[PDB]
Point group: D2
Chain length 223, copies 4
């Protein structure tokens, strides 16, 4: 049924689980959960607790850590969730590698490669979608402040014609809270977290951070 963006104002401070219920209400089993094989496993845990038939997809860029592959499959055989593992389109990837190597992002910035292995296939998925949710968090951002809202129009894949709504349940959640959650209920997590990795991306563009170092500095550090 119809609604207004004022809902996004209503769910501003509501707990993540409640924000999820909201989404599950309006969009039912049509809500897709974006799972990156990282601490966002919490979003998968909450979502799955509310809905045992929750739909979730992971963007396999073909360059994920072997640890991340093992984990995604783990969350799969743990919650009984046939995850949608999306791969890149060769006709897009192949030419890129061909003239630029398998590490162009080091000299051309991560933009291009991401766009082909991550962004493009994501766009393709969200097409036949009404709304989806990601575990993005306010605090996992440098500190430019809190830019993420719990509910908003997907300003990247949305069109006045075919609008796409996006939920960010873990927006107001802190890293410490995320880990308390995962540790408390003993959720499975990426092995990389026991090696100095807070923020997890693709193997070649992600590195561990030092004690007290912000998690974002473990991503595209050369940039």
């Amino acid at each position: 049924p119809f609604d207004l963006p004022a809902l996004a104002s209503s769910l501003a401070d509501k707990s993540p689980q409640d924000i999820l219920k909201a989404a599950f209400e309006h969009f039912g089993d049509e809500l897709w959960i974006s799972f990156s094989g990282a601490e966002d496993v919490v979003l998968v845990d909450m979502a799955w607790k509310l809905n045992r038939n929750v739909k979730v997809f992971s963007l396999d860029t073909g360059r994920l850590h072997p640890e991340t592959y093992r984990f995604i499959d783990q969350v799969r055989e743990h919650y009984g969730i046939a995850i949608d593992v999306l791969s890149p389109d060769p006709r897009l990837l192949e030419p890129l590698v061909k003239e630029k190597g398998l590490f162009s992002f080091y000299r051309d910035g991560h933009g291009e490669c991401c766009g082909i292995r991550k962004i493009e296939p994501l766009k393709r998925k969200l097409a036949g979608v009404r709304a989806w949710a990601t575990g993005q968090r306010r605090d996992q951002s440098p500190g430019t402040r809190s830019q993420v809202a719990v509910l908003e129009i997907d300003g990247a894949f949305s069109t006045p014609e075919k609008p796409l709504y996006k939920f960010n349940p873990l927006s107001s959640m802190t890293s410490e809270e995320v880990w308390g959650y995962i540790r408390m209920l003993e959720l499975p997590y990426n092995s990389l977290h026991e090696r100095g990795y807070i923020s997890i991306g693709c193997e070649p563009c992600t590195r561990p951070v030092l004690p007290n170092q912000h998690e974002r500095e473990g991503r595209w550090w050369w940039e």
Copy 2:
């Protein structure tokens, strides 16, 4: 120009470099070199030394050791070869992972996954191809004897209509000789060779092997 399969009887004992000259003679810049990011790097060195314009491709199953990606790119920047890195077809892969996970080969045998990530895209390549060479070696096989000939008709992708010739330069070259070669001319080699790896496949289906243990036992060991 035309030739007879007696040539395959001729090159039998000749050195790999000769077999490559022979190959380059008949098929020229059209002869493709299959590069797996492993000790077959020797083939690349030999072919490239003869033909600085040598064409080469590698099948990126989307599940290679990060060590492998870094190597393939090294050979690329080391020799000055715009290698062709081939990726799997989403429309073929995605469905497999959806209902079986990312480690099905552990219980269903490796055949199916290899078929989609490795074999299929290999076929799509050898299409517009007259002949190609791989670094397959006799001794790199368990011991069911020497089954590889230096030259033969591709018994997997060749057809009476459109034939495909395949060379195996390193056929008669022993492991010791392959490494004596690489170490001698100081070629670059996969970092994994320093961690116990002799034979290198994808990350999930490859494990290092013990002292004296055969190099084939580090591949699909569960089968």
Copy 3:
């Protein structure tokens, strides 16, 4: 000198100021204990106040190879002939004979540390007037006891013959320690890039998960 006077004045002063106090009163006889971890900050600060700063490390013979490498790197870097002390085979041998090499897993680190660290420490400190350590209040979840920037070492000194102990970094925080490390581009243990915050011996230390307290990475089974 005046223990109570100094213990008070120094209380809220900077680590550098505490070290200036220590060197001023004990000079080239103030020993700096270096465990091959974040306390490198202590070594650095002390080294800048006194190039000749005596320093020593307890080699329990079970440290992470990364720690052996780091300690030496510090040695070479600042040009400090660190005194790397080892266990007494006459004490360690019988312990390993009977209980093996990982007894501390079932008996608690008490015994082993007693023989590999403490006893060799006692011998060293025994012929010393004063020493310092990188112990920070910050390192324990602030329990019943806190670190004194200056104090009488109750553990290794007789009422009649006292030993003084300085903990300059007492009030410095983890974040401040690392900011210092990173800002001044100091050299640090490699383990710190693999999830290790606190750094003990290889068998009794483990990296910690994000946000997990650093002390939760030492003798975790206890």
Copy 4:
């Protein structure tokens, strides 16, 4: 007993037959040297001939953590109270003081090894009638001196007071060693699964490439 006679008779016999010989003449006074590597074969064989088999290991204090775990795993497995010996701080401390922790990189493993292995070895063997090692002709690229299955230990015994040394695996080859290991499912160092064939201290050992000789992974810089 008859050294020359026995050295000859044993020459071509099996490793077990050589251990049987050693035990028969020295019983519970024959020490088996275990370094935490493939020599586990020697331990397994000797253990099966004599459960009470004395066994010792030289803890240079710089061994691989994996080696520490393995040595203890063997201990626990066969139920052997292995004698893990350590260096003499009165000798090591001053070496590390002056030269640091990696002097061997620039002076050659001589001096260090001399203090962390040899010196403590001598002491041990000083009150021993005979011992045995896992040394094999196979381990060195067949140089000027080979391994006698039995011999006088000229290195550690005075002409008047001799010491006898047995090398049961003298003639056993790497390939055979591992077949034995894998066949009887013996426990082995983890570093074997990481490219290590020969295994010494962490800083002086390194894995070898395929077909590269195992000795090339020890003191490679020399």
